[PDB]
Ligand binder design. Sequence first.
Ligand SMILES: Nc1ncnc2c1ncn2[C@@H]1O[C@H](CSCC[C@H](N)C(=O)O)[C@@H](O)[C@H]1O
Length: 261
Amino acid sequence: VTLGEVWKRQLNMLGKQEFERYKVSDITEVDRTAARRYLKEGRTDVGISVSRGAAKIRWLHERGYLRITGRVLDLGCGRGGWSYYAAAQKEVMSVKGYTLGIEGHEKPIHMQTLGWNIVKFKDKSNVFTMPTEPSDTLLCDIGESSSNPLVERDRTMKVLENFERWKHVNTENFCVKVLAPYHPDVIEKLERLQLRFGGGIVRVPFSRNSTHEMYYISGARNNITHMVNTTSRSLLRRMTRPSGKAIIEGDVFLPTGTRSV
Ligand SMILES: Nc1ncnc2c1ncn2[C@@H]1O[C@H](CSCC[C@H](N)C(=O)O)[C@@H](O)[C@H]1O
């Protein structure tokens, strides 16, 4: 019924070539060539990011959509690109990363970029059921894509319900993935969270056109419904006239070393 749902139905109708051409049209991409090189070698003394995902939190951080500070929780940390980025920030005290790391799911990668000494990881951890702990900064990049919209809305809702469970009164800063923001249920859940916590929803330009994902962040205020539809219209406009060409940016590179306090 919504414009986003129309986008989803049209995406599921594209052929391979149409799909591949559409998914990169006018998006932004990091050059991952250097990092792939060193990750294959197995080098831990070079200042690369363990994931493509780090580019998203850098963008949000540098643009002022969120502050990164104090005790940091990274829920669904995967390889740990959000965790290592956080640990290199001078206002950051400690970083704790939780992820599944089971069959098919990625595990934490050990790296020695700046502040590695104040990062701790735990796999075999389900953030939906495990006990919560306090934080000043709460991060969550969870939300697996699906061609089924009802699967996407269920995964999204579950992420948002768990975020509310995790958020502490000290948690002034937050960044939560919203996989399928086009669903009316998801809009209603976001509006209700916003009433309590403030903040707003944003589209990160590093997301491919083949996902409608957006991020619920703490450092901006906006109209949820208007922001979701502005992205839907944008994703629809690109589908009609796909450029096939992405913007390339330099990757997330960090210093190495330990940090004091
Ligand atoms: N219920 C759950 N509990 C813990 N981790 C989960 C989870 N559901 C999904 N995940 C994990 O969440 C991760 C999202 S990918 C994380 C990317 C990360 N921001 C980075 O830059 O590296 C996946 O690895 C998936 O295994």
